[PDB]
Amino acid sequence: ATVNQLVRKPRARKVAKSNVPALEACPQKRGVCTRVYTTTPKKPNSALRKVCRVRLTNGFEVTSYIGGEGHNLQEHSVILIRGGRVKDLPGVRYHTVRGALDCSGVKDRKQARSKYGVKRPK
Amino acid sequence: ARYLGPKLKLSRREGTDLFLKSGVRAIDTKCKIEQAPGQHGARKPRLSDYGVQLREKQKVRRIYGVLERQFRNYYKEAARLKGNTGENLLALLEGRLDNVVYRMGFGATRAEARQLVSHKAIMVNGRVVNIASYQVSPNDVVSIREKAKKQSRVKAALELAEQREKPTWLEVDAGKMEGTFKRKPERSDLSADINEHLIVELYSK
Amino acid sequence: KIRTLQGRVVSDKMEKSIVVAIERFVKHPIYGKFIKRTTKLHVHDENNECGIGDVVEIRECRPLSKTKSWTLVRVVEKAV
Amino acid sequence: MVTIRLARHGAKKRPFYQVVVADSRNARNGRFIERVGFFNPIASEKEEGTRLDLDRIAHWVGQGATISDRVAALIKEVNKAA
Amino acid sequence: ELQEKLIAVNRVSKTVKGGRIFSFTALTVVGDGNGRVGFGYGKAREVPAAIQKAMEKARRNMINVALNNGTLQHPVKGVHTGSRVFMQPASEGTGIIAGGAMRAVLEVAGVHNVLAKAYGSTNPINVVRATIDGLENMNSPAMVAAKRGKSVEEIL
Amino acid sequence: SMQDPIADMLTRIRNGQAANKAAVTMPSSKLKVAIANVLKEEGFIEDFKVEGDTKPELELTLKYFQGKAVVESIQRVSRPGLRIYKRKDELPKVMAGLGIAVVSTSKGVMTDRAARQAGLGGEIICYVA
RNA sequence: UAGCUAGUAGGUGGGGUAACGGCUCACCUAGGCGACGAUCCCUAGCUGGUCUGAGAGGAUGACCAGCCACACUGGAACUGA
RNA sequence: CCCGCAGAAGAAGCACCGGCUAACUCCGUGCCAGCAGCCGCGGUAAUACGGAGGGUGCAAGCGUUAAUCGGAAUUACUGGGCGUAAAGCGCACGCAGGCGGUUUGUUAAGUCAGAUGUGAAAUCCCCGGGCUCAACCUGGGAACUGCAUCUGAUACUGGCAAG
Ligand SMILES: [Mg+2]
Ligand SMILES: [Mg+2]
Ligand SMILES: [Mg+2]
Ligand SMILES: [Mg+2]
Ligand SMILES: [Mg+2]
Ligand SMILES: [Mg+2]
Ligand SMILES: [Mg+2]
Ligand SMILES: [Mg+2]
Ligand SMILES: [Mg+2]
Ligand SMILES: [Mg+2]
Ligand SMILES: [Mg+2]
Ligand SMILES: [Mg+2]
Ligand SMILES: [Mg+2]
Ligand SMILES: [Mg+2]
Ligand SMILES: [Mg+2]
Ligand SMILES: [Mg+2]
Ligand SMILES: [Mg+2]
Ligand SMILES: [Mg+2]
Ligand SMILES: [Mg+2]
Ligand SMILES: [Mg+2]
Ligand SMILES: [Mg+2]
Ligand SMILES: [Mg+2]
Ligand SMILES: [Mg+2]
Ligand SMILES: [Mg+2]
Ligand SMILES: [Mg+2]
């Protein structure tokens, strides 16, 4: 606090870690489904939340949520994952991107279609 | 780009008359001006603070036919310019070419004026201008070219304008169909129902 | 009149050469405290007239050794 | 050697040349010793388009500066016009 | 003549043997624009009653403020519990660039051009209290001249 | 240790104002005398009186108007731990020009306004509002 | 990462450079750097600028321009202004 | 760039609508399916899921993710604190270091003042000008908060000398 003290030893900037460190400051990343499963939510939620453990192109083994009703994913299925946590599931930091490499868009969606990789119905 | 949807809808949502129709027949006859648009129109929820500011901004934008990026740019310009910010913004909006033609009266609506400008009916200083956002300068005469001078719509529009209250800051000749933009309008010349402090606050959120 | 600097002789062991601290009383960029910073310079002195701890005025010159590009002009305040 | 020449600036299809004194080795728009004028070939009427600092140019020539064909032409035009 | 406006209405609990008893507290602030501002808290079992009580309180315990041409007279600090407040005499036409509660109290007071910030806690009740305190603790050039024993021209 | 006499003097003045004491006394110094003179000129105190030969004591007579202190606030600025110097264009305006700032310039200790008029900076000793 | 350095630090004389110089060599002196961070480790081309911010600052160095370094990797010289 | 031809003709989507945050209803499911930036929603009347109608905001774009600054006075020089919220070494001595009562003299290092040189051009800002307008291009200024040198001032701080 004393100016002399500051001169001797200045103030450390508070290094804020990223909450999506497997991306490595990339907006998306490609990966291979190591394992596809359902899991129980955190404390006041009830569900079987769909999630895939994915080995990324840059070495990292993360787990990624799979949003939307129903999915075609299985083991060895290349999907795009993005940034975003599911809160009520512990340790899930990434969503899969629907509508890329090997992940389908949600069926019969008419709203938020861009969010669920759904093409314009005729 | 342009707003292409229902116009009386815009007026109803805002509350005021935005002059989005020619005004031969009154808007109370054209729509339920008191009731808001949609299933839940009669219900009127109480607007907090953000909402009121947003509504004011929407009103002004709708009245003139400026999209958000353009409006924001205009605001930036007003702030940059010396003097009062709201007044500057209003002056710029008025300066717009479509607005000037409408004020002169070579079009029933702002839409009509813009269409004419687009379709190359309007000369600024004897030079065909095509842009509705074209800033007119002081002492600039702007006239209908003869090809658009034969339009019955144009003559009808002139009559309608004659019905309306004529603006002091321009001087327009109906037979010659040319008007001289003598000076940038004063705030006293513009409408009192338009509030600028709300708009300024909104763009200073 | 020539550009010249004053400084204390921190050592004079190496023959024909002295090291001359040139303390300058600079202000700190951020905190505003005035901190004493030092600039040691190896200075050439012929005849080895200077002692350790003295005060000596020096000027810049063509390099006389790997580290020695300053020469002394006059010794002053040579008390012990 | 040192030369006195136009440097291309402006937009696509709308060149505006800054006449600069510069060591010929330097790139056209790169390092330059002194900027001694401008020339605007699409310049409209009631605009000069050209502006040559003649005294500086003369001084540089005396020092030994070669002149681009275009710059020479500009100088000739300026003298006639003025 | 008196412009008045309610800043915040807040729900409070007492927790009795039966269960909880809720009630509403309304903090209002009134002022004449010409300089005079006064805030009032108020508490009641229902919202409208609380606001009315608040209005009465506000109308009483007002305080006069020396305003120079619709803005402050000098940079002023204001303190209270959480509320550390800064307020600056900004140029005519800037408008009031000031937080929520702050904006309300200033507006009713009649300052049209100020730059404020609420540091520390921004708890409405304390920040309004702080702002009013700050406004009072602000003398005019006539007042400073009187205290120091000079003319206003000597002070500038 | 006593490390800042001017600061001590300022503190004494503030405490006197708080406690409604008529006069405040302290060991006199030349800088202190100059500061006192400046304060008197600007009218934040009624008078000062240096008294003694071997170790003289400055006695300031404090100023009251309506029950409250004339010296509303009085803060040290330059201090031994951190000296502050300003240029003539950077000279501060205390309380937007109502209060004064005592600045020690090349031509002696004077108020900020006087220094500004002269066209010279110096050590900003203290603000008074 | 708390000790580092033997052409190391300085001198004399030869040699070398377009040029001063441990640049190089022989001898002489025993120095030189270091808590105002040497040495060692990690990261990084630098600046005008850019973004942001009331400012003070923070982050950054794509495009345009100045400077530096590199040309498969590691060494070397020749020609030549 | 201009002139002529035909005919509304070839040209509107994306997100959101529980609060923060502008915009609400019905149907389907029934802690499931699903949503989510935060807080939260869903266990059979869901304005929070999915569809529909209606509405709101942007618009040739609109959303999501990543990244930097802001808000964050949340590294607090401007601009924080330490009894009980995180924070006074268990207590002392003490070198380097930081700070130094009061008077006079001297110095002018800090400090302050004026001048001179430089601080490339571009960029930013200001008044203009040119592309139909704008973006864009561009003239002239201002600015480049800096650094150096010379000549001054003697309050304060430093040095030196006596008290
Ligand atoms: Mg549950
Ligand atoms: Mg567009
Ligand atoms: Mg802004
Ligand atoms: Mg030798
Ligand atoms: Mg690298
Ligand atoms: Mg800030
Ligand atoms: Mg590149
Ligand atoms: Mg090689
Ligand atoms: Mg050769
Ligand atoms: Mg709402
Ligand atoms: Mg549930
Ligand atoms: Mg949703
Ligand atoms: Mg239902
Ligand atoms: Mg939700
Ligand atoms: Mg839904
Ligand atoms: Mg801070
Ligand atoms: Mg804290
Ligand atoms: Mg505890
Ligand atoms: Mg203790
Ligand atoms: Mg002393
Ligand atoms: Mg000392
Ligand atoms: Mg000096
Ligand atoms: Mg123009
Ligand atoms: Mg420049
Ligand atoms: Mg002294």
Coordinates of N, CA, C and O (backbone and C1' of nucleotides) in Angstrom, one line a residue, chain H residues 124-157:
Chain H
rC124 P -7.9 8.2 -38.8 O5' -7.9 8.8 -37.3 C5' -8.1 7.9 -36.2 C4' -8.0 8.6 -34.9 C3' -8.7 10.0 -34.8 O3' -10.1 9.8 -34.5 C1' -6.6 10.3 -34.0
rC125 P -11.2 10.5 -35.4 O5' -11.2 12.1 -35.0 C5' -11.5 12.4 -33.6 C4' -11.0 13.7 -33.2 C3' -11.4 14.9 -34.1 O3' -12.7 15.4 -33.8 C1' -9.1 15.1 -33.6
rC126 P -13.6 15.9 -35.0 O5' -13.0 17.3 -35.3 C5' -12.9 18.3 -34.2 C4' -12.4 19.6 -34.8 C3' -13.0 20.0 -36.1 O3' -14.3 20.6 -36.0 C1' -10.7 20.3 -36.2
rC127 P -15.3 20.7 -37.2 O5' -14.6 21.7 -38.2 C5' -14.6 23.0 -38.0 C4' -13.9 23.8 -39.1 C3' -14.4 23.5 -40.4 O3' -15.6 24.2 -40.7 C1' -12.1 23.5 -40.5
rG128 P -16.6 23.7 -41.9 O5' -15.7 24.0 -43.2 C5' -15.4 22.9 -44.1 C4' -14.4 23.3 -45.1 C3' -14.5 22.6 -46.5 O3' -15.4 23.3 -47.4 C1' -12.3 22.4 -45.6
rG129 P -16.4 22.4 -48.3 O5' -15.4 21.7 -49.3 C5' -14.7 22.5 -50.3 C4' -13.8 21.6 -51.1 C3' -14.4 20.4 -51.8 O3' -15.1 20.8 -52.9 C1' -12.4 19.8 -50.7
rG130 P -16.2 19.8 -53.5 O5' -15.4 18.5 -54.0 C5' -14.6 18.6 -55.1 C4' -14.0 17.2 -55.5 C3' -15.0 16.2 -55.8 O3' -15.5 16.2 -57.1 C1' -13.5 15.3 -54.3
rC131 P -17.0 15.8 -57.5 O5' -17.2 14.5 -56.6 C5' -18.0 13.4 -57.0 C4' -17.2 12.1 -57.2 C3' -18.0 10.9 -57.2 O3' -18.6 10.6 -58.4 C1' -16.2 10.6 -55.7
rU132 P -19.9 9.7 -58.5 O5' -21.0 10.6 -57.6 C5' -21.3 11.9 -58.0 C4' -22.6 12.3 -57.3 C3' -22.6 12.1 -55.8 O3' -22.0 13.1 -55.1 C1' -24.6 11.4 -56.8
rC133 P -21.0 12.8 -53.9 O5' -22.0 12.2 -52.8 C5' -22.9 13.1 -52.1 C4' -23.5 12.4 -50.9 C3' -22.6 11.8 -49.9 O3' -22.0 12.7 -49.0 C1' -24.4 10.3 -50.4
rA134 P -20.6 12.5 -48.4 O5' -20.6 11.1 -47.7 C5' -21.0 11.0 -46.3 C4' -21.4 9.6 -45.9 C3' -20.1 8.7 -45.7 O3' -19.6 8.9 -44.4 C1' -21.7 7.6 -47.1
rA135 P -18.1 9.2 -44.2 O5' -17.3 7.9 -44.5 C5' -17.3 6.8 -43.5 C4' -17.3 5.5 -44.1 C3' -16.0 5.0 -44.8 O3' -15.1 4.6 -43.8 C1' -17.8 4.5 -46.2
rC136 P -13.7 5.3 -43.7 O5' -13.1 5.3 -45.2 C5' -12.8 4.1 -45.9 C4' -12.5 4.4 -47.4 C3' -11.5 5.4 -47.6 O3' -10.2 4.9 -47.5 C1' -13.3 5.9 -49.0
rC137 P -9.0 5.9 -47.0 O5' -8.8 6.9 -48.2 C5' -8.2 6.6 -49.4 C4' -8.3 7.7 -50.4 C3' -7.6 9.0 -50.0 O3' -6.2 8.9 -50.2 C1' -9.7 9.5 -50.8
rU138 P -5.2 9.5 -49.1 O5' -5.4 11.1 -49.2 C5' -5.0 11.8 -50.4 C4' -5.7 13.1 -50.4 C3' -5.3 14.1 -49.3 O3' -4.1 14.7 -49.6 C1' -7.6 14.1 -49.6
rG139 P -3.1 15.3 -48.4 O5' -3.3 16.8 -48.4 C5' -3.4 17.5 -49.7 C4' -3.7 19.0 -49.5 C3' -3.2 19.6 -48.2 O3' -1.8 20.0 -48.3 C1' -5.4 20.1 -48.5
rG140 P -0.8 20.0 -47.1 O5' -1.4 21.1 -46.1 C5' -1.3 22.4 -46.4 C4' -2.2 23.3 -45.4 C3' -1.8 23.1 -44.0 O3' -0.7 23.9 -43.6 C1' -4.2 22.9 -44.3
rG141 P 0.1 23.5 -42.3 O5' -0.9 23.4 -41.1 C5' -0.7 24.2 -40.0 C4' -2.0 24.3 -39.2 C3' -2.0 23.8 -37.8 O3' -1.5 24.8 -36.9 C1' -3.9 23.0 -38.9
rA142 P -0.4 24.3 -35.9 O5' -1.1 23.5 -34.7 C5' -2.1 24.1 -34.0 C4' -3.1 23.1 -33.4 C3' -2.4 22.0 -32.6 O3' -2.1 22.4 -31.2 C1' -3.9 21.0 -34.1
rA143 P -0.7 22.0 -30.6 O5' -0.8 20.5 -30.3 C5' -1.9 19.9 -29.6 C4' -2.0 18.5 -29.8 C3' -0.8 17.6 -29.6 O3' -0.6 17.3 -28.2 C1' -1.7 17.1 -31.7
rC144 P 0.8 17.2 -27.6 O5' 1.5 15.9 -28.3 C5' 0.9 14.7 -28.2 C4' 1.7 13.7 -29.1 C3' 3.2 13.7 -28.8 O3' 3.4 12.9 -27.7 C1' 2.7 13.8 -31.2
rU145 P 4.8 13.0 -26.9 O5' 4.5 13.8 -25.6 C5' 4.0 15.1 -25.7 C4' 3.0 15.4 -24.6 C3' 3.5 15.0 -23.2 O3' 4.3 16.0 -22.6 C1' 1.2 14.3 -23.6
rG146 P 5.3 15.6 -21.4 O5' 6.3 14.6 -22.2 C5' 6.3 13.2 -21.9 C4' 7.3 12.4 -22.8 C3' 8.7 12.8 -22.7 O3' 9.4 12.2 -21.6 C1' 8.2 12.7 -24.9
rC147 P 10.4 13.0 -20.7 O5' 11.7 13.1 -21.6 C5' 12.3 11.9 -22.0 C4' 13.3 12.1 -23.1 C3' 14.4 13.2 -22.9 O3' 15.4 12.7 -22.0 C1' 13.5 13.5 -25.0
rA148 P 16.2 13.7 -21.0 O5' 17.1 14.6 -22.0 C5' 18.1 14.0 -22.7 C4' 18.7 14.9 -23.8 C3' 19.3 16.2 -23.4 O3' 20.6 16.0 -22.9 C1' 17.9 16.5 -25.2
rU149 P 21.1 16.9 -21.6 O5' 21.4 18.3 -22.4 C5' 22.5 18.4 -23.3 C4' 22.4 19.6 -24.2 C3' 22.5 20.9 -23.4 O3' 23.8 21.2 -23.1 C1' 20.7 21.0 -24.9
rC150 P 24.1 22.0 -21.7 O5' 23.7 23.5 -22.0 C5' 24.4 24.3 -23.0 C4' 23.7 25.5 -23.4 C3' 23.3 26.5 -22.3 O3' 24.5 27.3 -21.9 C1' 21.4 26.2 -23.5
rU151 P 24.7 27.6 -20.4 O5' 23.6 28.8 -20.1 C5' 23.6 30.0 -20.9 C4' 22.4 30.8 -20.8 C3' 22.0 31.1 -19.3 O3' 22.7 32.2 -18.8 C1' 20.1 30.4 -20.5
rG152 P 22.9 32.3 -17.2 O5' 21.5 31.9 -16.7 C5' 21.0 32.5 -15.4 C4' 19.6 33.0 -15.6 C3' 18.7 32.8 -14.3 O3' 18.9 34.0 -13.5 C1' 17.6 31.8 -16.1
rA153 P 19.2 33.9 -11.9 O5' 17.8 33.4 -11.3 C5' 16.7 34.2 -11.4 C4' 15.5 33.5 -10.7 C3' 15.7 33.0 -9.3 O3' 15.6 34.1 -8.4 C1' 14.7 31.4 -10.6
rU154 P 16.7 34.5 -7.3 O5' 16.5 33.3 -6.2 C5' 15.3 33.2 -5.6 C4' 15.2 32.0 -4.8 C3' 16.2 32.0 -3.6 O3' 15.7 31.8 -2.3 C1' 16.4 30.0 -5.0
rA155 P 15.0 30.4 -1.7 O5' 13.5 30.8 -1.6 C5' 12.8 30.9 -0.3 C4' 11.6 30.0 -0.3 C3' 11.9 28.5 0.1 O3' 12.0 28.3 1.5 C1' 10.5 28.7 -1.8
rC156 P 12.9 27.1 2.1 O5' 12.2 25.8 1.5 C5' 10.9 25.4 2.0 C4' 10.5 24.2 1.1 C3' 11.4 23.0 1.1 O3' 11.4 22.2 2.3 C1' 10.7 23.5 -1.1
rU157 P 12.7 21.7 2.9 O5' 13.2 20.5 2.0 C5' 12.4 19.3 1.9 C4' 12.9 18.4 0.9 C3' 14.4 18.1 0.9 O3' 14.8 17.2 2.0 C1' 13.8 18.5 -1.3

